[PDB]
């Protein structure tokens, strides 16, 4: 990376957006989210990811639920209404920057 | 803002990218960059912006030049070769995220 600071800042924003994107389509376990973000080209650790998850929930954008399924307790995450609205707004911001910088 | 944390993180990235975008086109003063980023919808002060400018120069992505013009000393910034390469990479990353996140 010629600009590691940019990549770092930008990756934090992109991860956040992908989490909402995925949690709007699906209920998600964190284990799975790590794999899926990795598929999308993002390096993420449990160390990085769960605190974001917790913070999104604290911001009211996600909600988590302890759920016993098939004799095993797990936490699932999903978007709240506010989270869907946030996703739209966050996307809008990305669209604007895309329009500006990809065309004095 | 439904997602202030996102906006905050994202604005840091967007400001950085705009600085390079503008400094690749032409030479720029920081006073002017404040106005121009403000035109583009980014809330920035000299207090916020100049440190970014200094940091980009320290990262080798910009270079500045003291110039005395019309009886007054001013600093102009421009992209270095490494900054143009960075610009391309940073744009690429933005295009990819755009394509992905726009079901």
UniProtKB/Swiss-Prot annotation, chain A:
Transmembrane segments: none annotated. Changing residue 22 to A: Abolishes cadmium and zinc binding. GO terms for molecular function: DNA binding; metal ion binding. The keyword DNA-binding applies. InterPro entries: Metal_resp_DNA-bind_regulator (IPR052509), Tscrpt_reg_PadR_N (IPR005149), WH-like_DNA-bd_sf (IPR036388), WH_DNA-bd_sf (IPR036390). May have transcription regulation and metal-detoxifying functions through which it may enhance intracellular survival of mycobacteria. Binds to its own promoter region and to the Rv1999c promoter region. It displays strong affinity for cadmium ions, but can also bind zinc, manganese and nickel. Expression increases the intracellular survival of recombinant M.smegmatis in murine macrophage cell line and increases its tolerance to cadmium ions. PANTHER family: PADR-FAMILY TRANSCRIPTIONAL REGULATOR, TRANSCRIPTIONAL REGULATOR RV3488. This is Transcriptional regulator Rv3488.
């Amino acid at each position: 990376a010629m600009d590691p600071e940019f990549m770092r800042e930008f990756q934090r924003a992109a991860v956040r957006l992908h989490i909402l994107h995925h949690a709007a389509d699906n209920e998600v376990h964190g284990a799975w989210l790590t794999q899926e973000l990795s598929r999308h080209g993002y390096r993420v650790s449990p160390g990085t990811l769960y605190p974001t998850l917790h913070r999104l929930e604290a911001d009211g954008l996600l909600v988590s639920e302890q759920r016993v399924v098939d004799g095993r307790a797990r936490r699932v995450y999903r978007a709240t209404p506010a989270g869907r609205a946030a996703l739209t707004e966050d996307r809008r911001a990305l669209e604007e920057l895309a329009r500006e910088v990809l065309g004095h």
